[PDB]
Amino acid sequence: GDIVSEKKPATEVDPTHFEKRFLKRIRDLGEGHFGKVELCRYDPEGDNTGEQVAVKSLKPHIADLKKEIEILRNLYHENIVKYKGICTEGIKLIMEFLPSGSLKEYLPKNKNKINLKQQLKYAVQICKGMDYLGSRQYVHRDLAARNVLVESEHQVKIGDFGLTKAIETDKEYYTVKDDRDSPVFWYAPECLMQSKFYIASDVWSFGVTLHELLTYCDSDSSPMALFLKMIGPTHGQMTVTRLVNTLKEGKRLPCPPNCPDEVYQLMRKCWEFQPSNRTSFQNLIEGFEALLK
Ligand SMILES: C[C@@H](O)c1nc2cnc3[nH]ccc3c2n1[C@H]1CC[C@H](C#N)CC1
């Protein structure tokens, strides 16, 4: 008889499925280690009215990006950047686009608008996001101002999860294997020395991130600039060991200009050499809130 074909089942629309053919690249936002993020417009109507979105893709580790996507897809918190969907055949992660960019872009341009009180409020928000992440048994491993996005003058969000790892149930840390592109000047001693990563290691990084926030992310005051001034900028492959030794002696980043001692002491509690001696995110929140009232 007639050409037998297949009966077509009724098509549903998945709002988390972005078709490659409507995803139009505008410009680069940043580079991770495994990958890069681009500003696109998703423009199915083809008239430049579609929503702007941030698109993470691999540099030509698919497994790692898929893991990152599954982590982010299931995080729900006002201080964590929103997952929007994926674009598949390879895969791309689609996230909300925050036009103000990271604290690295925003702070230098808005010093006059952002005073100590607003800085402490951002600090509380970063801790709340991080505490949420820790409650889900994750270690972030890349907490720095460049990964903290500005939603508005009043709100920030943790905006990248490229290095985030699950801590095994009943275990206390994650053991790192690939460490070549580590942000060593944000890293706690146990991370540097033994490649172990605790929730307390993220508390250490938070301290460094707070330092950046308090210096308005100026490049001449960045943790790297300041540490290389402390240990020497010409040690090449001995840099990390020199860093470890400086930290062993008790040396830390100095108090930022105009930063009250009481804020600097909260920062120093993040940098206890021993993980078990460091403050917690919940204690930091309490400390900041007390300074705000
Ligand atoms: C300008 C740059 O800091 C930036 N602007 C963004 C706006 N919306 C975004 N949504 C997701 C990321 C993202 C953004 N990123 C960076 C943040 C850090 C990321 C990394 N690693 C690269 C893109």
CA pseudo-torsion sign 203, 152, 92, 15: positive
Q: Where is the domain boundary, 97, 128, 147?
A: 97
In a domain, 220, yes or no: yes
Q: How far apart are CA 60 and CA 69, in angstroms?
A: 18
Which residue range forms the structural domain that includes residue 65? 11-97
Pairing mode, if any, of strands 83-88 and 52-58?
unpaired
Does residue 276 share a domain with residue 176?
yes
Regarding the beta carbon of 222 and ligand 1, being less than 6 Å apart is answered no
Ligand 1 atom index nearest CA of 147: 18
Q: Is 221 exposed, middle or buried (0-12, 13-18, 19+ CB in 10 A)?
A: middle
Regarding the beta carbon of 30 and ligand 1, being less than 6 Å apart is answered yes
The experimental technique used to determine this model is X-ray
Q: Amino acid letter at 50?
A: G
Q: What is the DSSP string of 117-171?
A: HHHHHHHHHHHHHHHHHHHTTEE-S--SGGGEEEEETTEEEE---TT-EEPPTT-
Q: Where is the domain boundary, 97, 119, 144?
A: 97
Active-site hit among 14, 64, 142, 202: 142
**How many whole angstroms from 98 Cα to the centroid of ligand 1?**
8
HSE at residue 56, side-chain half, CA atoms within 13 A, is 29
Return the SS3 of 225: helix
Nearest to 223 by CA among 260, 160, 270: 270
Does residue 187 share a domain with residue 254?
yes
**How many whole angstroms from 145 Cα to the centroid of ligand 1?**
11
Q: Amino acid letter at 205?
A: S
Does residue 198 share a domain with residue 274?
yes
Q: How far apart are CA 13 and CA 5, in angstroms?
A: 23
In a domain, 3, yes or no: no
**42: phi then psi, degrees, rounded to nearest 5:** -90, 110
Helix segments in 149-258, DSSP class H: 189-194, 199-214, 223-231, 239-248
Pairing mode, if any, of strands 83-88 and 174-175?
unpaired
Catalytic residue at 142?
Answer: yes
Cα separation values, 161 from 1, 34, 158, Å: 57, 11, 8
Chain breaks in the chain (C to N over 2.5 A) after: 60, 89
Which protein residue has the closest C-alpha to ligand 1 atom 22? 30
Q: How far apart are CA 17 and CA 3, in angstroms?
A: 33
The CATH code of the domain that includes 84 is: 3.30.200.20
Which are the contacts of 210, defined by CB distance < 8 A and separation ≥ 6?
Answer: 123, 126, 266, 267, 270
Does residue 90 share a domain with residue 47?
yes
Return the SS3 of 86: strand
Cα separation values, 64 from 34, 132, 162, 224, Å: 8, 22, 8, 27
Regarding the beta carbon of 81 and ligand 1, being less than 6 Å apart is answered yes
For 182-191, the CB contacts below 8 A with 24+ separation are: 183/142, 183/144, 184/239, 184/240, 184/243, 185/223, 185/224, 185/227, 185/243, 186/142, 186/143, 186/144, 186/223, 188/275, 189/244, 189/247, 189/248, 189/273, 190/275
**How many whole angstroms from 36 Cα to the centroid of ligand 1?**
9
**How many whole angstroms from 1 Cα to the centroid of ligand 1?**
59
Q: Structure tokens of 118?
A: 């607003």
Q: Which residue from 26, 37, 61 has its CB within 8 A of the most atoms of ligand 1, so it is best to mutate?
A: 37
Q: Structure tokens of 214?
A: 């308090």
Contact 133, 287 (CB under 8 A): no
**209: phi then psi, degrees, rounded to nearest 5:** -60, -40
Q: How far apart are CA 238 and CA 243, in angstroms?
A: 9
Does residue 230 share a domain with residue 121?
yes
Return the SS3 of 99: coil
Does residue 127 share a domain with residue 182?
yes
Q: Structure tokens of 20?
A: 């490659």
Q: How far apart are CA 126 and CA 155, in angstroms?
A: 10
